[PDB]
Amino acid sequence: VLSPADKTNVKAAWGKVGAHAGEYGAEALERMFLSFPTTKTYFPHFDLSHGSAQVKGHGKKVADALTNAVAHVDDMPNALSALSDLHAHKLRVDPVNFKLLSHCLLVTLAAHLPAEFTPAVHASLDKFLASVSTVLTSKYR
């Protein structure tokens, strides 16, 4: 459950991110691949070399989806409907992996938001990612 305050916090932090959503999204994936190599099993068909167009492009899609979620923070199931379907029925990514990407996005935000990443904001962002993860894995079975 995202409290009113959580939503305010997330909207403030994400605003801050603004135009870098894409670059941040690529760096979070790269941090994942390096830190948690088993996640690479889902990208056998990708060029995972540092700064590959594939990763840069995909990082941008991931960032856009999160921006959509912040925008529709109050109606996430609806907002991410097509993505939950994709992940659940097409990609079939084990749910454990959502925690790993979430941690990596959290690290990326921390590294890029020195003024904004206060303990309160860190808590709200962590809850937000958990919430997005829940939505994305809700149609798996």
Binding site: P37, T38, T41, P44, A88, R92, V93, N97, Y140, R141
Partner: protein
């Protein structure tokens, strides 16, 4: 994996009663039914759309037999799981692209199947020994991932 004489005894005793073919097919089948995302590795096995389709699929039973057979061989080398599964570890990483989280799900379903099949004989202590074993096997199979 370090097992107490008692845990080792328990494991071996029960295993003597397992029909690897039968149990292997059931375990793989239940994996595909209970965690449907696991079906991502079996696109060429045919019909997996319903529980009855999965359970009665000849490619599923065949594969189940294969997997539990390799598992079986591992019981004989409980003292060196990593070395015993190194080749298969690498295969699953390098060629098959299997997320090792699947080894963990299979381990748990196997425990469920053992319980189902043996009933009262699958006591809490026996369960605990098998839990150490399936954990061990999963770790050994994930060891060569990179």
């Amino acid at each position: 994996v370090h097992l107490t004489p008692e845990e080792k005894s328990a494991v071996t005793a029960l295993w003597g009663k397992v029909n690897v073919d039968e149990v292997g097919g059931e375990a793989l089948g239940r994996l595909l039914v209970v965690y449907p995302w696991t079906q991502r590795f079996f696109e060429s096995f045919g019909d997996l759309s319903t529980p009855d389709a999965v359970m009665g699929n000849p490619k599923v039973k065949a594969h189940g037999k294969k997997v539990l057979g390799a598992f079986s061989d591992g019981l004989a080398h409980l003292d060196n799981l990593k070395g015993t599964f190194a080749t298969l570890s690498e295969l699953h990483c390098d060629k098959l692209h299997v997320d090792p989280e699947n080894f963990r799900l299979l381990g748990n379903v196997l425990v469920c199947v053992l319980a189902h099949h043996f009933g009262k004989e699958f006591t809490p202590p026996v369960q605990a020994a098998y839990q150490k074993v399936v954990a061990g096997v999963a770790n050994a199979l994930a060891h060569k991932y990179h």
